[PDB]
């Protein structure tokens, strides 16, 4: 198996920092939106629903920011030591719980609430831009894939760590028989197993750059849509 390296504690902190920026970006844009729905009496209860979601994201965030990785990682001599997949298991577990929570929040916010706003307000002052919705999905799909990568590469995969959207894509493709295995769907693309932490750290940095890119683009669309709710 793979044993931990001295830089394991930092690697964990970096990965969690990714999720923290993910959560904070939502908390920032939703607190603006929640504060604006206060003047719209017809959306009084949809406002409280979003508040419940934000509090969950807040808790998810200040739990990530409070977690000290070096506290739950025993190094010793390069043993006796903690296996590397032991320290990653609760990290990927955290990502899964947050990702599925996002899946819930994303649907309500980008589908249900959108249709309810148009029905109640009869205009599009307080709706999300089509640009932002794509940023929501694009960011979600990659945090999903990254979560799957941490799990499958270390072979810590089970039914308890499965993400729904990945499992949906698998069975939907298993039914329609799609196909030769080209494949365009990222959820259907297989994960190569990691043979060393030196390889896990490298590939994590590659994801870290990509996920920050999507997160950066997500921040951009939130700024634009927060402008539309100017007054």
């Amino acid at each position: 198996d793979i044993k931990v390296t001295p830089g394991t504690s930092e690697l964990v902190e970096q990965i969690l920092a990714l999720l923290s920026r993910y959560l904070s970006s939502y908390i920032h844009v939703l607190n603006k939106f929640i504060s604006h729905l206060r003047r719209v009496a017809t959306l009084r209860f949809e406002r409280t629903t979003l508040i419940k979601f934000v509090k969950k994201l807040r808790f998810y965030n200040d739990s990530v920011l409070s977690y000290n990785a070096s506290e739950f990682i025993n190094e010793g001599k390069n043993p006796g030591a903690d296996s590397f997949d032991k320290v990653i298991l609760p990290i990927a577990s955290m990502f899964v719980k947050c990702v599925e929570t996002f899946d819930l929040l994303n649907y309500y916010l980008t589908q249900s609430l959108q249709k309810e706003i148009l029905s109640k307000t009869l205009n599009e002052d307080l709706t999300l831009t089509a640009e932002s919705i794509l940023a929501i999905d694009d960011t979600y799909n990659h945090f999903v894939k990254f979560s799957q990568w941490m799990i499958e590469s270390l072979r810590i995969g089970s039914n308890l760590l499965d993400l729904e959207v990945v499992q949906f894509a698998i069975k939907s493709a298993d039914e329609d028989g799609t196909n030769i295995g080209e494949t365009d769907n990222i959820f259907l693309q297989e994960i190569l197993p990691v043979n060393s932490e030196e390889e896990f750290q490298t590939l994590s940095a590659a994801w870290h750059s990509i996920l920050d890119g999507k997160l950066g683009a997500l921040d951009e669309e939130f700024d634009v849509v927060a402008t539309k709710w100017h007054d």
Partner: peptide, 8 residues
């Protein structure tokens, strides 16, 4: 779309 550690 080239994701690392992922066989496209």
């Amino acid at each position: 779309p080239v994701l690392p550690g992922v066989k496209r």
